C-alpha cells in the first residue's frame, strides 16, 4: 500500500491549492479517507473526511468553508481543495486510509507527506547583533559570547567565526520562524576570559539568497 | 472535546512503560475506540493499537507483543502500554478518539527510551546589545544546550510579573554529542525594555527549573 | 447604498487623521465615518479578467459513426483498415482465437482492427487568466443630501456627486474618485495578493463557468485539442470517450461512454465559481485591502443654516441588523437648502447628545416644498429619544435598542 | 403577559447571586424586561 501527495508548496494569505494523493496497491473504491495536518513541531490534526463513495464528506470547523474534498475512484485520486488560505494552515498534510469496519475504524496507512507553506513576506536580508557578556562568571574563566541574526526570510544562513580561525566552542542554533513571516538565529562561542583584551573577536554571517554578507564586531 | 496527554515521558528498556490519555468529561473513556499512531523522527506516523477492551484490540502490523492497552474510569484516561522497553520504542505516540465525524488527536507524548544519565541544561541569556536599541528595537536571546530529553519549558519574566507577548522558542533539536538545543527570544521596543528593572529567562526540565536575569544596568 | 446589506461593517475612520484601511469584500459593503467628513459607503461590486485567452479543450460529450472492423487470419499478417491512421478515427487493434469454426485454415491467434469516427457534440473550454491583468470596480456612495431611494440607484451619478465608480488594476493600485462638492477621495489598493492567478485557469463548461488550477486541468482524462477551431480540430486520447468490448473473431463492438457532465461537475465541487456575460463578465471575489485618504473631501452645506419648518416621518424609524435606525422625514419649507436638526437625547431638555449620528451633516436640497430626506442614526444602548427639528412643530420619537 | 413566578426575589446579600424565573409572555412580538431605570436588562421575545 502507497500513499503519495502532491500538489502542495509556498503560497501566500488568500488564493488557493489542490493536493492530490495517487493510491495503489489496495483497492481503493472501497475504504473512506482523511486528510491529517501536523505543523511544523506540532501534533496532529484532522482535516477532512470523504466515504468510499463520495455520498458522505465531513470537514473541520477550522477549515469549513473553505476547504472541501473530492474524490476519484476510476484514477485512484484523492484530493483536497484549500480556499482561503491563512497563516494557520500552514502544515504538512498526510493523505491517510480512514477504514469503516464493524464497530472497528482508524488511521490504517498514511503517507509521508506534502508540505504547504502560507507566508506573507517575498524576500528579506537579516540584521545581525553582537551578543558580549559584561559578566564575568570566572568558572576556569570561561566567558560565553555570540552574534543573533535577526530577521531573515530564506533559511540557509552560514554563521562563521573569525574567518574559519574559530573552530573549537563554536556553537550555532537552530532558527525560529516568528509571527512576521521571517526567520531569527544566534550563534555563540565560549572562550577563556585571558583573550578578553587580545583576541578581536568577530562573527562572520552570510545570507546567499539575499547577497548579503555581514561581518560584525562581536 | 479535548484528550490530553503529557508532553514527554521518558524511561529506561525493560521497563513497563506507561502512556497516558486522558478524556474530556465530554467522552467516557469505556466506550470508546482508543487509536495509537507512533511517529518516529523522519517518518510518517503508523496505527500502533487499536484499543477497546482487553477482549477488543488489534495490533498494528509489525507491533510486537509488548504492546498493550487498557483504560481506567474514574480519571476517563487510557493507556498505552510497552512491556519490556527497547531503544527502538523511541518516538512520539498520539491517541485519537473518533467522535460524530470529528477526528480528535491528543497533544502527542515525546517518549524517551531513556540513553543518557540525565543531563543538566545548560542556560545562558544575553540583553539587547547597543546597534540594536539606537534601532529602536530589543531583542533578548535565551540559549539552552546540552540537556536530557528534548523537552524543556521557558517562561519569560518582568518585574515579577509573567509575560506572554514577543516570545518564541525553538524546538529541541539533537545536536552532536545526541543532546539537545533549543532558544528562546523575547522581542521587545527599546522602551519596553527600558520600563522594568529586570527580566528573566525561566526554563524547566523534569520538574526543576533554571533561572537566568538580565538588567538594563 | 450599504444600508440593506447584510455584511454591512462599520469601520470607524481616525478621526483627524486622514489615515483608515479596509478590507472590502464581494458582496459586502463597507461604511467609513470620519470627523467633520461626509461618511461614504464603499462597495466593491465586480472583479473582472479581460484577457482571455483558449489554452485547451476538452470534450465531455461525443458521437460515433462508421463502425468497422477487419480480421486476418494467423500467418497472414497484420490486420489493416483504410481508415486506422485517420485523425478523427478511433481504433484499436487485438489478438482473437480464430481456426475451423471461424472460417479459417489453422488453429491459431488471428489479428483484428476494429475504428469508428469520433465527433465531438458538447466541449468544455480552458483559457488563460493573464496575471497582472485584472480589473476591480468599486463603488461610493455619499450620506446627508441622500434620501433611501438612492440605496439602490445607479444611474445619475456623474451629474450627482453622490455616487462615483472607481477602476483598480494591476500597474495601477492608485486612484481618485471626484465627488465635486464632496471634493475628492483617493484610495490605493491592489493587494498583489498571492491568489496566484498565474496559476489558474478559466473553465468554461455550459453556461457554467468555474476558476481552475493548471496541475489538474492538464491532467483531465477526456478528449481534447490545444488551440481554437479552424476547422475539424484533432482530438487526442479519444480512447477516453470510447471504449471496444469483447472482440469476437471478425468484430468488435464500440460505445460511446456518454456525457461527462456529472462527473466534471463533481470534480469541481468547492472551486472558486465565476460567470460570464457581456463577452467580459467574471469572478464572484473579494478580499481587496485598501487605504484611502479623504483629505480632499469636503463637507458640502456647512454654510447652511439650520431648517425652520416642520418635519413629518414618511418612514418610522426602523432598526437594521446592526443595530443602526435609518429615518426618512418630508419637510414643508422654502428655507432649503438648509442643515437638518437632528440629534438623539435621554435628555429632553437641554439638549444633552447622546449617540452619533452615521449621515453626518445632514441637509435638504431641493427648496420648495415638500422634500423627502432619509437619514440614520447609531442610538446608544439603553433608551434614548429621536429628536429632528427644533423648537415647536418639532418631531420626537422614543427608541429602545437591544 | 403573565409571570408564573410570582414575586421574584433575590435572598443572598452579598454579592453576586444566582436567581430564576419564569415568565408567560404574549402571542406575538415581545422584550423581556428585567431591572430598573439605567443598566436594566432587556431582551426581545417572539414566541410562536
Known amino acids: 500500500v502507497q500513499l503519495v501527495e502532491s500538489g502542495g508548496g509556498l503560497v501566500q494569505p488568500g488564493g488557493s491549492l489542490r493536493l492530490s494523493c495517487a493510491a495503489s496497491?489496495?483497492?481503493?473504491?472501497?475504504?473512506?479517507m482523511s486528510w491529517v495536518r501536523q505543523a511544523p513541531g506540532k501534533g496532529l490534526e484532522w482535516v477532512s473526511y470523504?466515504?468510499?463513495?463520495?455520498?458522505?464528506?465531513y470537514y473541520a470547523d477550522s477549515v469549513k468553508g473553505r476547504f472541501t474534498i473530492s474524490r476519484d475512484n476510476s484514477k485512484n485520486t484523492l484530493s483536497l481543495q484549500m480556499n482561503s488560505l491563512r497563516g494557520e494552515d500552514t502544515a504538512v498534510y498526510y493523505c491517510?486510509?480512514?477504514?469503516?469496519?464493524?464497530?472497528?475504524?482508524?488511521?490504517?496507512?498514511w503517507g509521508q507527506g506534502v508540505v504547504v507553506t502560507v507566508s506573507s513576506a517575498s524576500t528579506k536580508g537579516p540584521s545581525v547583533f553582537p551578543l558580549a557578556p559584561s559578566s564575568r562568571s570566572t568558572s576556569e574563566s570561561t566567558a560565553a559570547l555570540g552574534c543573533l541574526v535577526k530577521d531573515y526570510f530564506p533559511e540557509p544562513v552560514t554563521v562563521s567565526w573569525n574567518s574559519g580561525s574559530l573552530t573549537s566552542g563554536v556553537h550555532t542554533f537552530p532558527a525560529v520562524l516568528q509571527s512576521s513571516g521571517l526567520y531569527s538565529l544566534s550563534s555563540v562561542v565560549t572562550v577563556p576570559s585571558s583573550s578578553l583584551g587580545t583576541q578581536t573577536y568577530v562573527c562572520n554571517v552570510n545570507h546567499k539568497p539575499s547577497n548579503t554578507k555581514v561581518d560584525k564586531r562581536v | 472535546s479535548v484528550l490530553t496527554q503529557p508532553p514527554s515521558l521518558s524511561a529506561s528498556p525493560g521497563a513497563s512503560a506507561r502512556l497516558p490519555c486522558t478524556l474530556s468529561?465530554?467522552?467516557?473513556?469505556?466506550?470508546?475506540?482508543m487509536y495509537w499512531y507512533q511517529q518516529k523522527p523522519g517518518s510518517a506516523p503508523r496505527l500502533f493499537l487499536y484499543?477497546?477492551?482487553?477482549?477488543?484490540?488489534?495490533?498494528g502490523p509489525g507491533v510486537p507483543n509488548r504492546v498493550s492497552g487498557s483504560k481506567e474510569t474514574s480519571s476517563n484516561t487510557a493507556f498505552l502500554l510497552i512491556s519490556g522497553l527497547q531503544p527502538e520504542d523511541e518516538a512520539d505516540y498520539y491517541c485519537?478518539?473518533?467522535?460524530?465525524?470529528?477526528?480528535?488527536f491528543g497533544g502527542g507524548t515525546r517518549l524517551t527510551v531513556l540513553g543518557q544519565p540525565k543531563a543538566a541544561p545548560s542556560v545562558t541569556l544575553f540583553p539587547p546589545s547597543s546597534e540594536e536599541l539606537q534601532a529602536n528595537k530589543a531583542t533578548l536571546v535565551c540559549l539552552i544546550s546540552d540537556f536530557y530529553p528534548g523537552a524543556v519549558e521557558v517562561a519569560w519574566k518582568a518585574d515579577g510579573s509573567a509575560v506572554n507577548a514577543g516570545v518564541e522558542t525553538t524546538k529541541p533539536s539533537k545536536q552532536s554529542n545526541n543532546k539537545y538545543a533549543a532558544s528562546s527570544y523575547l522581542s521587545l521596543t527599546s522602551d519596553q525594555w527600558k520600563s522594568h528593572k529586570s527580566y528573566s529567562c525561566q526554563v524547566t526540565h523534569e520538574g526543576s527549573t533554571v533561572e537566568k536575569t538580565v538588567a538594563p544596568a | 447604498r450599504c444600508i440593506g446589506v447584510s455584511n454591512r461593517d462599520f469601520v470607524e475612520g481616525m478621526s483627524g487623521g486622514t489615515w483608515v484601511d479596509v478590507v472590502l469584500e464581494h458582496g459586502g459593503c463597507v461604511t467609513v465615518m470620519a470627523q467633520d467628513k461626509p461618511t461614504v459607503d464603499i462597495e466593491l461590486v465586480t472583479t473582472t479578467v479581460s484577457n482571455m485567452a483558449e489554452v485547451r479543450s476538452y470534450c465531455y460529450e461525443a458521437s460515433i459513426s462508421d463502425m468497422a472492423s477487419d480480421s486476418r487470419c494467423p500467418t497472414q499478417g497484420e490486420a489493416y483498415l483504410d481508415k486506422q491512421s485517420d485523425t478523427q478515427y478511433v481504433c484499436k487493434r487485438t489478438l482473437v482465437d480464430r481456426g475451423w469454426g471461424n472460417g479459417c485454415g489453422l488453429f491459431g491467434k488471428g489479428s483484428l482492427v476494429t475504428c469508428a469516427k469520433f465527433a465531438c457534440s458538447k466541449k468544455m473550454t480552458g483559457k488563460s487568466i493573464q496575471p497582472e491583468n485584472l480589473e476591480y470596480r468599486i463603488m461610493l456612495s455619499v450620506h446627508g443630501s441622500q434620501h433611501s431611494g438612492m440605496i439602490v440607484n445607479d444611474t445619475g451619478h456623474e451629474t450627482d456627486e453622490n455616487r462615483a465608480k472607481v477602476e483598480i488594476t494591476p500597474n495601477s493600485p492608485r486612484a481618485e474618485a471626484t465627488l465635486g462638492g464632496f471634493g475628492s477621495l483617493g484610495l490605493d489598493c491592489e493587494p498583489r495578493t498571492g491568489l496566484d492567478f498565474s496559476d489558474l485557469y478559466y473553465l468554461t463548461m455550459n453556461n457554467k463557468h468555474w476558476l481552475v488550477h493548471k496541475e489538474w486541468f492538464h491532467d483531465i482524462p477526456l478528449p481534447w485539442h490545444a488551440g481554437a477551431d479552424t476547422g475539424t480540430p484533432h482530438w487526442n486520447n479519444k480512447e477516453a470517450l470510447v471504449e471496444f468490448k469483447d472482440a469476437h473473431a471478425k468484430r468488435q463492438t464500440v460505445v460511446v461512454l456518454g456525457s461527462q457532465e456529472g462527473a466534471v461537475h463533481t470534480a469541481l465541487a468547492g472551486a472558486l465559481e465565476a460567470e460570464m456575460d457581456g463577452a467580459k463578465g467574471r469572478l464572484s471575489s473579494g478580499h481587496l485591502k485598501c487605504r484611502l485618504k479623504m483629505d480632499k473631501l469636503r463637507l458640502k452645506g456647512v454654510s447652511y443654516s439650520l431648517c425652520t419648518a416642520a418635519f413629518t416621518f414618511t418612514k418610522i424609524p426602523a432598526e437594521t441588523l446592526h443595530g443602526t435606525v435609518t429615518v426618512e422625514v418630508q419637510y414643508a419649507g422654502t428655507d432649503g437648502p438648509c442643515k437638518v436638526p437632528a440629534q438623539m437625547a435621554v435628555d429632553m431638555q437641554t439638549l444633552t447628545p447622546v449617540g452619533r449620528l452615521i449621515t453626518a451633516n445632514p441637509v435638504i436640497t431641493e427648496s420648495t416644498e415638500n422634500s423627502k430626506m432619509m437619514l440614520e442614526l447609531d442610538p446608544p444602548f439603553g433608551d434614548s429619544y429621536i429628536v429632528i427639528g427644533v423648537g415647536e412643530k418639532k418631531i420626537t420619537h422614543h427608541w429602545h435598542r437591544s | 403577559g403573565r409571570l408564573i413566578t410570582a414575586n421574584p426575589v433575590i435572598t443572598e446579600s452579598t454579592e453576586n447571586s444566582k436567581m430564576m424565573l419564569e415568565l408567560d409572555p404574549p402571542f406575538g412580538d415581545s422584550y423581556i424586561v428585567i431591572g430598573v431605570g439605567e443598566k436594566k436588562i432587556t431582551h426581545h421575545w417572539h414566541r410562536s
Open positions: 491517510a486510509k480512514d477504514i469503516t469496519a464493524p464497530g472497528r475504524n482508524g488511521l490504517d496507512s
Open positions: 496497491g489496495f483497492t481503493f473504491s472501497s475504504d473512506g
Open positions: 470523504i466515504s468510499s463513495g463520495g455520498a458522505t464528506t
Open positions: 468529561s465530554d467522552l467516557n473513556v469505556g466506550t470508546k475506540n
Open positions: 484499543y477497546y477492551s482487553d477482549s477488543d484490540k488489534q495490533l
Open positions: 485519537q478518539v473518533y467522535d460524530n465525524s470529528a477526528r480528535v
